[PDB]
Design a protein around this ligand. Structure first.
Ligand SMILES: [Mg+2]
Ligand SMILES: [Mg+2]
Ligand SMILES: [Mg+2]
Ligand SMILES: [Mg+2]
Ligand SMILES: [Mg+2]
Ligand SMILES: [Mg+2]
Ligand SMILES: [Mg+2]
Ligand SMILES: [Mg+2]
Ligand SMILES: [Mg+2]
Ligand SMILES: [Mg+2]
Ligand SMILES: [Mg+2]
Ligand SMILES: [Mg+2]
Ligand SMILES: [Mg+2]
Length: 47
RNA sequence: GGGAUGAGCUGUGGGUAGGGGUGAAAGGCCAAUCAAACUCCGUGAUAGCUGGUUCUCCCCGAAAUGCAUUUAGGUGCAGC
């Protein structure tokens, strides 16, 4: 009853990771680290 | 300082247009840009390259080696 009583099951929904938002999280390279290809592009699986 | 009746200078009007013109030839000039003008479009071209990437705390925590490579400042797999 009463729409203000519905809550999702625990573990069903978890917040997305925002990756370029300061030093306390994935800071500036956003997990990329490198200076090479992988810092700006993807490497094809076939290469 | 050079020429200053000459292969002179100059006005007005016109013509040659981009891998094309024009050049007593320097790759010179073609609207302050020229070893291929400019504008718009393809187009948010591509760049193994440079730069940038924004709030917090808790736990753990490297590598800079091997192999191969049109490879050596890149990448794949292993190692961590
Ligand atoms: Mg910073
Ligand atoms: Mg990562
Ligand atoms: Mg890398
Ligand atoms: Mg490096
Ligand atoms: Mg950087
Ligand atoms: Mg593909
Ligand atoms: Mg004319
Ligand atoms: Mg020459
Ligand atoms: Mg000019
Ligand atoms: Mg041209
Ligand atoms: Mg060309
Ligand atoms: Mg296209
Ligand atoms: Mg520790």
């Amino acid at each position: 009853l009463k729409l203000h009583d519905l809550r999702p099951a625990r573990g069903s929904k978890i917040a997305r990771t925002r990756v370029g938002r300061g030093d306390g999280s994935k800071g500036k390279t956003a997990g990329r680290g490198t200076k090479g290809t992988r810092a700006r592009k993807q490497v094809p699986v076939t290469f």
